[PDB]
Amino acid sequence: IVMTQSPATLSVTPGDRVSLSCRASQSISDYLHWYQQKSHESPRLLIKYQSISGIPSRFSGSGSGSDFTLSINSVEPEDVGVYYCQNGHSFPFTFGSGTKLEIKRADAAPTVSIFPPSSEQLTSGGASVVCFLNNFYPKDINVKWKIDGSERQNGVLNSWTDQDSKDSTYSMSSTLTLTKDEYERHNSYTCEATHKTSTSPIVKSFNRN
Amino acid sequence: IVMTQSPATLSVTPGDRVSLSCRASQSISDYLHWYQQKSHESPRLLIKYQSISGIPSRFSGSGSGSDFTLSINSVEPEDVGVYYCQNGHSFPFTFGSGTKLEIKRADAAPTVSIFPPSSEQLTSGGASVVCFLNNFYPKDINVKWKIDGSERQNGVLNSWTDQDSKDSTYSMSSTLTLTKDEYERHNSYTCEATHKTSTSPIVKSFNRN
Amino acid sequence: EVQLQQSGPELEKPGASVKISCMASGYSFTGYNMNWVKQSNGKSLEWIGNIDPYYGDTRYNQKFKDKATLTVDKSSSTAYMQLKSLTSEDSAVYYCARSRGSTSYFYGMDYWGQGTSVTVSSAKTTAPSVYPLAPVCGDTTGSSVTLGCLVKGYFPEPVTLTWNSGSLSSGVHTFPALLQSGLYTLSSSVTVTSNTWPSQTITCNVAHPASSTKVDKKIEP
Amino acid sequence: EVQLQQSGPELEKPGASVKISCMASGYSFTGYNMNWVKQSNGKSLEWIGNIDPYYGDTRYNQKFKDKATLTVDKSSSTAYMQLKSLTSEDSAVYYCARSRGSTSYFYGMDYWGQGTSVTVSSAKTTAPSVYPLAPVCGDTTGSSVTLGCLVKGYFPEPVTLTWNSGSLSSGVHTFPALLQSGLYTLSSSVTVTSNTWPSQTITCNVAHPASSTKVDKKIEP
Amino acid sequence: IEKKIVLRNGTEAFDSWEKPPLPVYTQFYFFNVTNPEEILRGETPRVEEVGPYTYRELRNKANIQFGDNGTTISAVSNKAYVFERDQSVGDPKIDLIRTLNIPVLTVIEWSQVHFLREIIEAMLKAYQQKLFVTHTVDELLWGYKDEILSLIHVFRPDISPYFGLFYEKNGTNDGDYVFLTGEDSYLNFTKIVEWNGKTSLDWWITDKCNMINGTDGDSFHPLITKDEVLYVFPSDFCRSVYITFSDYESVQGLPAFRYKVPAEILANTSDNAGFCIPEGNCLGSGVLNVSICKNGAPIIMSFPHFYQADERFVSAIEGMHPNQEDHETFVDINPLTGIILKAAKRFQINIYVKKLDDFVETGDIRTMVFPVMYLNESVHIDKETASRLKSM
Amino acid sequence: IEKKIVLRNGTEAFDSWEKPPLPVYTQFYFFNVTNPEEILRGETPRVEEVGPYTYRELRNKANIQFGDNGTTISAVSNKAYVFERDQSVGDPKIDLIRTLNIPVLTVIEWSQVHFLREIIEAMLKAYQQKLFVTHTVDELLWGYKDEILSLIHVFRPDISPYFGLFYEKNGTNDGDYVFLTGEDSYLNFTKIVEWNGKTSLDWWITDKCNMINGTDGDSFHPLITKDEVLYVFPSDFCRSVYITFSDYESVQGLPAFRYKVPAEILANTSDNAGFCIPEGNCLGSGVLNVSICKNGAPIIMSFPHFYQADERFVSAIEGMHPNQEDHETFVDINPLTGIILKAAKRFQINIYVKKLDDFVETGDIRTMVFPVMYLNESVHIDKETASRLKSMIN
Ligand SMILES: *[C@@H]1O[C@H](CO)[C@@H](O[C@@H]2O[C@H](CO)[C@@H](O[C@@H]3O[C@H](CO[C@H]4O[C@H](CO)[C@@H](O)[C@H](O)[C@@H]4O)[C@@H](O)[C@H](O[C@H]4O[C@H](CO)[C@@H](O)[C@H](O)[C@@H]4O)[C@@H]3O)[C@H](O)[C@H]2NC(C)=O)[C@H](O)[C@H]1NC(C)=O
Ligand SMILES: *[C@@H]1O[C@H](CO)[C@@H](O[C@@H]2O[C@H](CO)[C@@H](O[C@@H]3O[C@H](CO[C@H]4O[C@H](CO)[C@@H](O)[C@H](O)[C@@H]4O)[C@@H](O)[C@H](O[C@H]4O[C@H](CO)[C@@H](O)[C@H](O)[C@@H]4O)[C@@H]3O)[C@H](O)[C@H]2NC(C)=O)[C@H](O)[C@H]1NC(C)=O
Ligand SMILES: *[C@@H]1O[C@H](CO)[C@@H](O[C@@H]2O[C@H](CO)[C@@H](O[C@@H]3O[C@H](CO[C@H]4O[C@H](CO)[C@@H](O)[C@H](O)[C@@H]4O)[C@@H](O)[C@H](O[C@H]4O[C@H](CO)[C@@H](O)[C@H](O)[C@@H]4O)[C@@H]3O)[C@H](O)[C@H]2NC(C)=O)[C@H](O)[C@H]1NC(C)=O
Ligand SMILES: *[C@@H]1O[C@H](CO)[C@@H](O[C@@H]2O[C@H](CO)[C@@H](O[C@@H]3O[C@H](CO)[C@@H](O)[C@H](O[C@H]4O[C@H](CO)[C@@H](O)[C@H](O)[C@@H]4O)[C@@H]3O)[C@H](O)[C@H]2NC(C)=O)[C@H](O)[C@H]1NC(C)=O
Ligand SMILES: *[C@@H]1O[C@H](CO)[C@@H](O[C@@H]2O[C@H](CO)[C@@H](O)[C@H](O)[C@H]2NC(C)=O)[C@H](O)[C@H]1NC(C)=O
Ligand SMILES: *[C@@H]1O[C@H](CO)[C@@H](O[C@@H]2O[C@H](CO)[C@@H](O)[C@H](O)[C@H]2NC(C)=O)[C@H](O)[C@H]1NC(C)=O
Ligand SMILES: *[C@@H]1O[C@H](CO)[C@@H](O[C@@H]2O[C@H](CO)[C@@H](O)[C@H](O)[C@H]2NC(C)=O)[C@H](O)[C@H]1NC(C)=O
Ligand SMILES: *[C@@H]1O[C@H](CO)[C@@H](O[C@@H]2O[C@H](CO)[C@@H](O)[C@H](O)[C@H]2NC(C)=O)[C@H](O)[C@H]1NC(C)=O
Ligand SMILES: *[C@@H]1O[C@H](CO)[C@@H](O[C@@H]2O[C@H](CO)[C@@H](O)[C@H](O)[C@H]2NC(C)=O)[C@H](O)[C@H]1NC(C)=O
Ligand SMILES: *[C@@H]1O[C@H](CO)[C@@H](O)[C@H](O)[C@H]1NC(C)=O
Ligand SMILES: *[C@@H]1O[C@H](CO)[C@@H](O)[C@H](O)[C@H]1NC(C)=O
Known part of the structure; x- marks a missing residue:
């Protein structure tokens, strides 16, 4: 059930294409959820099953089985925080460690x-x-x-x-x-x-x- | 099923006791409730089936069969209001006209x-x-x-x-x-x-x- | 405990309809009866009807069977009453209270609600106008000094009044509302020691719900 | 609008037990799982379990599981956590979030409550003493002047800092607290133009929940 | 000199009317759910066309007694269904299909409206039910026993535990009838007057929409002119529908008129505002709520593949390709005798589905009109009769 | 000496042990409620006695295999209740009796604690139930269909739709039973070693309360001293009870000791604190909470008319008059052979009834131990069994 995501701190110029990889030891089919947490805010859903969801942005995700990816068209200064992928297929739905990106200015x-x-x-x-x-x-x-x-x-x-x-x-x-x-x-x-x-x-x- | 009884008004005295009767068209056995409504308040129970109370203090009820009687043994100015009976027997229960209890001074x-x-x-x-x-x-x-x-x-x-x-x-x-x-x-x-x-x-x- | 909060006072024109609620709290709603009682200002206490949440019972008095219908609410234990084809005779105060069991005789209303005033009238609402009542000049030496507050031509009842926002209740006297020409009026009187005034300011705090307003007038010596 | 409102920040002695509640609104609570998530200071969320009140089940993480008992959210409107055998390592922030998922497939977490910082420690609660920070002398002819608030020596977390009753929010950021000898200390640096000082009084507002304090100190020129 | 058409114990039209020599064929087309697990996540369904499963109808006329002066007649029409295999694709008892669990969607529509609200909800939380079932074809239209309905049958032994689109319609009638024959006038030949004891319906709102006009669609009055609009009362569709003229077309040697249903039979025209059973939203063009005449089920009627309908009804489901000559409903009549030559009546059954917070079995499903199955009922005039119509 | 009392094939004590010669009679006494509606107002109930309906028991034992060296035996005893009209007052198939609707109180308990919580409670709100139902005397203790259990029979065919007190206890045994014999030593003559594969009970809390001391109940070990605290395990009482000495009595021509039940049984001492299954929330002295014993019912055990019970239980029900020789339970046994001469065993069955805010069926009823029925299983020896008992020593 354990899964990991890389890397550990990114820097965007901003406005760049970014790759966020989430890989799981076991196959999950297409059940990944990708949450976003800011400074002093509760985490918020972004993409439901590596498919568009939520309702407030571009963010896109792809993949199937294992080795999933979340990517951003262009980075704005209001995307600063941490990102966590979510196992959905197998109990316990196991959250992955944080990515967390720094923003370059x-x-x-x-x-x-x-x-x-x-x-x-x-x-x-x-x-x-x-x-x-x-x-x-x-x-x-x-x-x-x-x-x-x-x-x-x-x-x-x-x-x-x-x-x-x-x-x-x-x-x-x-x-x-x-x-x-x-x-x-x-x-x-x-x-x-x-x-x-x-x-x-x-x-x-x-x-x- | 009309009530009525000793109508209806007086001024005991910070001392003497009272009565206040209630008559029934039918026999009704022992189902009379005697509500008290102060000057600007919702009616509050008082005596249940001519014996019981609740949490209102030194009051009492006598009589059964067809006629009933309330009683205040000590009587203070704080209990100046109206008192209605209610037939709990064959509905629609209905009430009495009420008696206003005054007080002399x-x-x-x-x-x-x-x-x-x-x-x-x-x-x-x-x-x-x-x-x-x-x-x-x-x-x-x-x-x-x-x-x-x-x-x-x-x-x-x-x-x-x-x-x-x-x-x-x-x-x-x-x-x-x-x-x-x-x-x-x-x-x-x-x-x-x-x-x-x-x-x-x-x-x-x-x-x- | 076992609070009963009734829906506020309401005005409706003859021929219209009104829906009131009692909104229970502090007990398991699914168990008690929740009667409705109509006590006209004359006190002619009347028993309207009986609902029963556990079974959905319906029994009403046959003098109000054609007029009122009682509905449920399960959650929030709220409980509604539908007044139909209003007449000026239905101008009343409507209470509600708990009961239990039945299938025969009746027990008693353990705990009652506050009451809802229903004014059936074809008159429009009117904002109250408050005039302070300062004593006659040269009253001078008295142990106490009495003064008043006049609320004229406000409709409809009710209208909360208060002296210095609930701080004063010593010699306060709220008088009942009397009306003529479709406009209610009232006044209030309070007695204070002669030495305080005008060192401590005195304000009349009235409020009308039907027309959501609230005014205040400092007394001018 | 789902308005998942939870809860009170707490502290407890090591070995004691604390219970939390989520008390959701805006949706028919039944058929929504209501998950619980904990987050150490070092982020990295971990999912504790869920309930799903419709069918009446529970799902816990085994290694983590011994500690918490997600009692039936009382098919009314509220969520219970009830952590037991408290440890100093369990001091973290506990979030909750609903799920629309049915059976064995996760449907994701719609909305989240703001969470509750549970502090497991055997320490006394203490009040903060605050000190307004006026800048040097020489009249600061430059465009901008800067002020500070120090609020030293308090416990536990958090304390809420606001400038001039909350009106002034445009130019100030507040700094995290620092554990110093069993107490806390944070500073807040507000920046305004020299056009409004010291004629326009800017003041720091400090409110500590546990100690029940409310301090308003005025910066001396 | 056309009195040889009139309905009587003597004429040759009664022999045609007691047991039509023309064979009627009914073929069923089901919609197989490709991605059931993805619909509950909140995605667009994908259906597949299965069929035909063709049956042949055995139409009779029982309980016949002349009424009034001989100007009316009464009868019930028993319909049987012999299974024709050579026109079907597979055995309906072996071939499985996976559609909506309609039984458990009805008991949620009964749940609300406070038929057994408390007991229905309690069973559902104790006996978990799947939103998509998988039963053989022979069971979906000829009855199959459901768990939920069986347990409800205990409390109220008046609702059968089985469920079927055509449950127990094999060999039985669809109500009492009484027909106007032709003495009165030719314009009311085999015209409908009374059905079961009510001169008109009362499921719908307006008095117009509840009226019963025309015939039962099985025969028409002679001297048909391309001017008029023929009204038809199908016993199943819960309303009286009219068919307007198209253009000339011949079948066999006989001439014929081609009557087809218009598109405002189903639009939200104000003339059909009384057909949506709550005053207000009519659910849209090209569809009709037929829940009241069924046992409260959320069944929605329409044309196959949502022909003559709105456009959001077709894109909400993958696999719906509407076009004429495939899903259009027509009737080819003889303008002289009013006798019908060729026809093709095409109805579709749907289930209105929506995500409900009070029930998990729905999930995050889309609000839509999910199709289940459709059919045509067809008839093609034989060859030996094309020569019999002679010597006017 | 008295090695004639132990049981092998051919022993005179073995034939009486298999098919008892002493006629056992059972008399049932019911409590007819007089003012049901008044109890639903929070009043004091008024009940009336409706006994006796005497039933003659038929006792015999099957499945007998001698184990080990012959020191252990195993058997199962049967009870068949034949009605005897002469000694009974009225016919049980005619007379009506009115008590609590026990089935609707059972499922409330099964609702209280979980089980089919939502669906019963919904069904109870759906189907209207009265607290006091009137069925025939034969219907109460021999089974009736009622309504709820017929509807719960659909969802879980586990349970039976029929409810009764002695429901289908005619011809069946009280479970397995393996006994000892006085081969190793006469002290443990008919001592029970294991009931149903369990060498100890599991219903109660402490290890002492869950023990099984004693005998099946209707046999004893020879050479009894007038200070012996003899134990006994009745299957219906769900615990091990003991009996101490009362006074001297002579039944027929044989001397005997009259043993009775002390008040420390079902008392409120710490020795009976392990039976407080509500975990130290025992009721007044004199009542046993044998609910877990029984299915899930709130069946409270006590002596008839609450004899040796607290004063609170007696005053709570009007029509309860406890006294000795009417509601005492005693056993007069020959001290030499330990053979039962004259015995009288009197149990009472009660139902815990209190008012509930989640159920209107209770109404405004008081919180009390409500009595239902009590019975006397009496056995008395006759002369032809006593004149057979001419064996002094041989
Ligand atoms: C396809 O066709 C079907 C069948 O015609 C439609 O179903 C009808 O519409 C709705 C279903 O959503 C139903 O309306 C609601 O019915 C509930 C039950 O009412 C009964 O029960 C109460 C109390 O038990 C009785 O007093 C009453 O007389 C009824 O017998 C009610 O809960 C609703 O009440 C009210 O809601 C609001 C208050 O919030 C009021 O303002 C309304 O005026 C209303 O009175 C409501 O009545 C309706 O009953 C269904 N009819 C039938 C015959 O089943 C489908 O909706 C339709 N599908 C689509 C997509 O349109
Ligand atoms: C005579 O003896 C009987 C038993 O022999 C006693 O009945 C026991 O006592 C009470 C009933 O009053 C029961 O205790 C309650 O059990 C409920 C059900 O627990 C089950 O369900 C949960 C959830 O599904 C499971 O996790 C669990 O493992 C069990 O399977 C609980 O829900 C109760 O908690 C609630 O009630 C108590 C009040 O007692 C509150 O304090 C709680 O906060 C909560 O609201 C409670 O634990 C017990 O189970 C009964 N046992 C049996 C075998 O039935 C009688 O009470 C006793 N009579 C007298 C007069 O002493
Ligand atoms: C099994 O258990 C039951 C229940 O305990 C016993 O039934 C009781 O039997 C005793 C003894 O026979 C009864 O006690 C007696 O009550 C009499 C009351 O008057 C009755 O008289 C006749 C019956 O002959 C009825 O017609 C009449 O209506 C009354 O029912 C008293 O007269 C008796 O008093 C005598 O003995 C006492 C002993 O101290 C003396 O004080 C008296 O002066 C007098 O000599 C006696 O008290 C008791 O009433 C029965 N109960 C019921 C409910 O009927 C069974 O006896 C018991 N054993 C057997 C084998 O069945
Ligand atoms: C009852 O209803 C069914 C369903 O509508 C109906 O069966 C349909 O029959 C038609 C005509 O026989 C079929 O349409 C044909 O489909 C194949 C597609 O695989 C085409 O090759 C055919 O095309 C020829 O004819 C067209 C005429 O316009 C030309 O455009 C084309 O170029 C070719 O010449 C033709 O379109 C249709 O596939 C079936 N549908 C199903 C689901 O089987 C049946 O006829 C109706 N009546 C009766 C009495 O059964
Ligand atoms: C509809 O009913 C008819 C008769 O009521 C059934 O037709 C008969 O079916 C039996 C059994 O298969 C055959 O032996 C007969 O030969 C059939 N009769 C004729 C005239 O062919 C028919 O099977 C029923 N259809 C369904 C789907 O149940
Ligand atoms: C049955 O009655 C008539 C058929 O003649 C239909 O109502 C007609 O509607 C048109 C257009 O609105 C009017 O011009 C006619 O005057 C109406 N007829 C009458 C008699 O008033 C009605 O719609 C038919 N029923 C159905 C279900 O279609
Ligand atoms: C079917 O037609 C009715 C009108 O007869 C529609 O109601 C109208 O909706 C449009 C929205 O584009 C509004 O501009 C009109 O003002 C509405 N008219 C009335 C009288 O309300 C109805 O919405 C249509 N049905 C559907 C499903 O769209
Ligand atoms: C069953 O076992 C013994 C019977 O001897 C009972 O416990 C004895 O209690 C006395 C005083 O309370 C102690 O002095 C003995 O030591 C106890 N015996 C043992 C073996 O420890 C016990 O209470 C009996 N249980 C029942 C339910 O009757
Ligand atoms: C049964 O006895 C226990 C104690 O053995 C009672 O619990 C005690 O109640 C008395 C009240 O008279 C208190 O003074 C004691 O402090 C209590 N002790 C304990 C350990 O709880 C219990 O109340 C008795 N039961 C009944 C029904 O009276
Ligand atoms: C028969 O048709 C004529 C003409 O269309 C009509 O006037 C008459 O009312 C019809 N008969 C009945 C019973 O409707
Ligand atoms: C009974 O026999 C002796 C006599 O007391 C005793 O020691 C022994 O333990 C008992 N036997 C069994 C099997 O319990």
């Missing part, structure tokens, strides 16, 4: 804002400083926290945004959480990010005044 | 209040003088609208409320509908009303000023 530098700890958090005993990286490509990026000449590799939390369905741009927050009195020992503070665009890193800083 | 002086027509009503073209007589006992009372010593028996509308559940007091609204031209010709407007609670007529008055 024009390289764009990240615009960064820096935020000192708020007056509310200071009088409470904590001192987390926040740095926001917004709308960039590609996803790969390294941030460098250095309070002064000293560099920080500890107590840094990084949360990544999944690319937008409208314009494929990633976002990211780099929070540097610190103890109140540990914050109150060094004057300046610097957040800076290094991207593929512009070997010179983007640098933002402030002082404790 | 100490004499009460009414709170007369007089209101000239509103300014928002005058710009709309009408003129009505409202006169309220609330919180009083007993029910018997009449009003007399005098304007410039006139008589004004026409164009008067009165509404009577029923006994309150808490303090057994009535209330009456009395409203003198009028045209703006008629209002703007005379100037003195009184709504005096006599009651058992006092010698002479209680009068709240005002004149257009």
